[PDB]
């Protein structure tokens, strides 16, 4: 365990998960070599898809067990963001699996 | 600044969702931690900064946010304060004006302090001093504080319910539920009488053991009985042993506040982390006779169906269900907003004083009542309006429309069941 009480496994898994999300979204945003990701619901759903896929990659490892994702509607985004060409308000949640490291045991012996 | 192409801030703190509904809570407490007469917060973390864990203004906020989904916002009001000094200083005023005072080695010392204060040309006019010693408001000052071991200090609320309520309303009118830290018989009754003349709801608790005995309301004279006798339909009273220094009223408020008006029932409510009403003497749940004694007073309580605590009935002191009161208030607000939106936005035109203009108002009133019918709050309604050919000419000069009326019918719900059966070989 770390000095803060958190298992090393949790810390390292969270860091890897962040790195995987960062790489997947980077690969989506790059490689638009001749097109756009328009600032409407069609473009937002494409980002939802990659976030969900990258979280499913973690669920497959048995690191997580379930997750959820929420994204904003393109019809209610402030116009400052549309000029800055940035997307905000994306969030997600997850749940951890766990493991076993110790055992407690009791028994009895008798003639009957 | 430079921002990464993808930014990811992952954390380990679980979080829950909030919700928005009709009405927001306000907690009126005796405090001096800020100058404004009303200040808002959005989470318990913000409340912890201004207040310590042992203050009632913190317990009330802690109870409120225990329920799920959360309430969006919470307001805290400040009561007027008076300070007292004795012999077993620093004086502050609105605007950050502070002046220290000192005398070196009791009436002589108190008079020395009084003379120093009354001689100071900066802070004296905003406060008052009198001989123990007493310090109160003066002039425009709405805030005053005294702090300081050869001198002792004390504090006490120095206003009535009427004055505090008026002073807080003259600052912020955005709140529906109101609860109070003070639980004395006089203040509670005064606040109940004041809120009756307003479209607000006053939640209060009680732990008076004299309320658990006697079924005749005529002879009883505790606070719940007096509230019931006055038919204060806008007052909700809850009986709970821990009402001495804890505030379950806020949990009860948060139970139904997050939801829409007129579409829920406040009875049989389940509150998280709140124990049942226990007899103070032996810490056992109330007997049926004590529950009946509370019932005749129109006072609520936390019952046990056998393994689960649930607030029962959920009625105001006047006998009217909380749901009806809140739904009627929401309906009025909706009508007020819809007609306001019609009357405004005539930016370049008129609503002529003839039948063509009157039918347009009929239309919006009907639509706003249909909005309530869709919630299953009402079941049917009717509207009547005057003819433009028979309106008095004084109204046409005043540019006002009168004689509009409507009616509605309520839906209802089910909260209890009665059952009978038989068993036989045949």
């Amino acid at each position: 365990i770390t000095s803060g009480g958190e298992w090393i496994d949790i810390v390292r898994g969270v860091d890897w998960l962040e790195s995987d999300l960062k790489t997947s979204l980077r690969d989506l945003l790059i490689n638009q070599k001749g097109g756009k990701i328009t600032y409407d619901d069609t473009g937002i759903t494409r980002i939802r898809q990659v976030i969900e896929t990258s979280l499913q990659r973690a669920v497959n490892r048995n690191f997580l067990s379930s997750y959820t994702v929420n994204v904003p509607k393109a019809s209610q985004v402030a116009l400052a963001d549309k000029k800055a060409r940035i997307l905000k308000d994306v969030t997600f949640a997850g749940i951890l699996a766990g493991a076993i490291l110790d055992v407690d045991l009791k028994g009895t012996v008798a003639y009957e | 600044m430079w921002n990464p192409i993808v930014n990811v801030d992952i954390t380990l703190n679980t979080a829950g969702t909030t919700r928005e509904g009709f009405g927001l809570p306000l907690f009126l407490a005796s405090t001096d931690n800020f100058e404004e007469r009303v200040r808002g917060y959005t989470s318990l973390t913000e409340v912890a900064e201004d207040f310590d864990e042992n203050t009632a203004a913190y317990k009330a906020a802690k109870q409120l946010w225990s329920q799920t989904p959360k309430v969006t916002q919470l307001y805290i009001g400040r009561r007027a304060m008076q300070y007292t000094v004795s012999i077993p200083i620093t004086v502050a005023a609105g605007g950050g004006i502070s002046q220290p005072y000192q005398y070196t080695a009791a009436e002589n010392v108190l008079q020395q302090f009084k003379t120093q204060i009354e001689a100071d040309p900066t802070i004296k006019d905003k406060v008052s001093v009198n001989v123990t010693m007493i310090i109160t408001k003066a002039g425009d000052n709405d805030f005053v504080k005294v702090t300081t071991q050869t001198v002792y200090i004390a504090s006490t609320t120095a206003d009535t319910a009427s004055t505090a309520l008026a002073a807080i309303e003259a600052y912020s009118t955005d709140w529906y539920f109101i609860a109070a830290e003070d639980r004395t018989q006089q203040f509670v009754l005064a606040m109940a009488s004041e809120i009756q003349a307003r479209k607000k709801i006053f939640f209060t608790a009680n732990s008076d053991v004299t309320a658990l005995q006697g079924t005749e309301l005529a002879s009883a004279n505790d606070v719940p009985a007096q509230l019931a006798k006055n038919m204060y339909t806008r007052t909700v009273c809850l009986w709970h042993h821990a009402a001495a220094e804890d505030y379950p009223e806020m949990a009860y408020i948060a139970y139904g506040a997050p939801y829409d008006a007129g579409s829920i029932a406040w009875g049989n409510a389940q509150l998280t982390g709140v124990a049942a009403s226990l007899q103070p003497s032996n810490q056992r749940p109330l007997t049926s006779i004590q529950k009946s004694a509370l019932d005749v007073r129109h006072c609520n309580f936390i019952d046990l169906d056998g393994g689960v605590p649930v607030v029962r009935r959920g009625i105001t002191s006047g006998g009217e269900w909380i749901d009806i009161v809140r739904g009627v208030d929401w309906l009025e607000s909706d009508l007020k907003t819809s007609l306001r939106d019609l009357l405004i936005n005539q930016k370049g035109g008129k609503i002529t004083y003839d039948d063509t203009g009157i039918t347009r108002i009929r239309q919006v009133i009907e639509t706003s009542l249909q909005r309530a019918v869709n919630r299953n709050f009402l079941s049917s309604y009717t509207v009547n309006v005057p003819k433009a050919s028979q309106v008095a000419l004084a109204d046409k000069k005043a540019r006002i429309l009168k004689d509009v009326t409507f009616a509605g019918i309520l839906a209802g719900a089910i909260l209890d069941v009665d059952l009978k059966g038989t068993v036989a070989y045949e």
Binding site: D41, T42, Q49, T53 | -
Partner: protein
């Protein structure tokens, strides 16, 4: 009161990072489970015992117009996956966005299963693409 209104215009499908557009005039989407949830067994005497099937796969059939540009993207994606080692992954979540909530399912680890049949005549004929999924999850907005 009346229920929420359906609108085909505000339905968006996505898979493998691309958006699928150009829905056909009729029946442009279908979702279905492969097996039922329960399978009763009845003895000669009338007793009943229930079997709870573990299979949860499904199929997603999306149908597009004849000249839609999304047909080229899927063909180009399929051509790439034929020249990849077995160790490389080919599955991705099939996400459907519908503000009316008339679609209750999403495809977990979906793959491309079949190619459209091509027919030509005096008029335009649609093209059907078929997908699979490891688990066709039915969810809802909790009341």
């Amino acid at each position: 009161a009346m229920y929420q209104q359906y609108s085909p215009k505000d339905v968006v499908c996505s898979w493998n990072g691309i958006a699928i557009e150009g829905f056909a005039p009729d029946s442009f989407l279908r979702l279905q489970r492969t097996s039922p949830l329960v399978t009763p067994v009845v003895g000669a005497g009338g007793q009943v015992a229930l079997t709870r099937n573990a299979d949860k796969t499904g199929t997603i059939e999306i149908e597009l117009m004849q000249t839609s540009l999304s047909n080229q993207m899927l063909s180009a994606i399929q051509a790439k996956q034929d020249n990849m080692e077995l160790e490389e992954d080919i599955s991705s979540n099939f996400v459907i966005y519908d503000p009316s909530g008339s679609v209750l399912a999403t495809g977990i680890n979906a793959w491309l299963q079949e190619l459209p049949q091509i027919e030509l005549g005096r008029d335009q004929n649609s093209k059907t693409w078929i997908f699979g999924c490891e688990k066709l999850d039915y969810t809802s907005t909790i009341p």
